[PDB]
Amino acid sequence: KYVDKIHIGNYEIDAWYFSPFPEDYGKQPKLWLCEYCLKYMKYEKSYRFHLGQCQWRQPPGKEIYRKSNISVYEVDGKDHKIYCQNLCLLAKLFLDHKTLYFDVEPFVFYILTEVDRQGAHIVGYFSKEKESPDGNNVACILTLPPYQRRGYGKFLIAFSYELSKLESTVGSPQKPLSDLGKLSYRSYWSWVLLEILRDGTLSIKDLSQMTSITQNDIISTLQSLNMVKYWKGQHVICVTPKLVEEHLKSAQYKKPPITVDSVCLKWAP
Ligand SMILES: [Cl-]
Ligand SMILES: [Zn+2]
Numbered sequence: 001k002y003v004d005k006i007h008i009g010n011y012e013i014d015a016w017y018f019s020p021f022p023e024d025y026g027k028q029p030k031l032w033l034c035e036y037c038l039k040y041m042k043y044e045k046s047y048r049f050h051l052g053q054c055q056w057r058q059p060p061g062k063e064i065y066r067k068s069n070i071s072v073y074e075v076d077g078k079d080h081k082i083y084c085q086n087l088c089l090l091a092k093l094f095l096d097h098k099t100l101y102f103d104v105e106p107f108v109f110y111i112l113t114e115v116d117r118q119g120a121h122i123v124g125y126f127s128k129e130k131e132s133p134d135g136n137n138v139a140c141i142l143t144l145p146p147y148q149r150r151g152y153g154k155f156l157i158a159f160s161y162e163l164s165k166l167e168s169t170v171g172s173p174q175k176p177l178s179d180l181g182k183l184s185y186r187s188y189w190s191w192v193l194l195e196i197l198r199d200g201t202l203s204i205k206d207l208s209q210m211t212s213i214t215q216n217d218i219i220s221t222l223q224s225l226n227m228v229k230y231w232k233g234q235h236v237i238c239v240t241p242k243l244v245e246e247h248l249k250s251a252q253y254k255k256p257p258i259t260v261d262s263v264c265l266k267w268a269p
Helices: 023-027 042-055 081-091 152-166 179-198 204-209 214-225 239-250
Strands: 007-008 011-012 032-033 062-065 068-076 107-115 122-131 136-138 141-143 228-231 232-236
Touching: 023 239, 032 042, 068 081, 081 107, 081 122, 107 152, 107 179, 122 152, 136 152, 152 179, 179 204, 179 214, 179 239, 204 214, 204 232, 214 228, 214 232
Parallel strands: 007 032
Antiparallel strands: 007 011, 062 068, 068 107, 107 122, 122 141, 228 232
């Protein structure tokens, strides 16, 4: 028997996929997680004890972003092996194609939290290879189920590209994306490109430089917006500024409820 339900903070969440917690953890009805340190436990009694003993009120690592009550923590998987091993076992419950759980040192994880008087509550995260051969600025990304479809997912994507911009480099997420992944990325890419095309002759490589979105990713977005022509084996951006405004005004695209503010980011490569 696999883990199939978890209790974390005040949420219970059913699992979507196999996650390789040790066998005897699968045995239990629920898995109980500390919402701050992410320690997993077998019983409500050990959960309650931990709750009253644990001193953590936020993720480990560095708070590299604070705007209002949204915070992002940078955790190095080398400096915090166990926390990150726990994060990965948690994420694998909802990510089908996540492969890495124990070998965490090559990764740095970015933790989205919303803060109240009690502490900083994890809402989602994305991991990133420290050095990427394939040029992936995200390895895995995930908004926890009860928080999905509220702009946290898109905040994370936005954020992963803000980091790429400060590294003066283009990047694409590791594939395959989930269906929620695909939709959120195509939506983010769309909004970013449309917003910019509103404000005069920019090549696709010019757009790639400004946004840190790869040329393939810009091309495939522009195709779905119907703003790219094919000429002699070359993708040519063909934009009618009325159809740009047309698109924006529509329902499909809009400022996410919540956005990355480059000012409130305290990070450098
Ligand atoms: Cl659920
Ligand atoms: Zn704890």
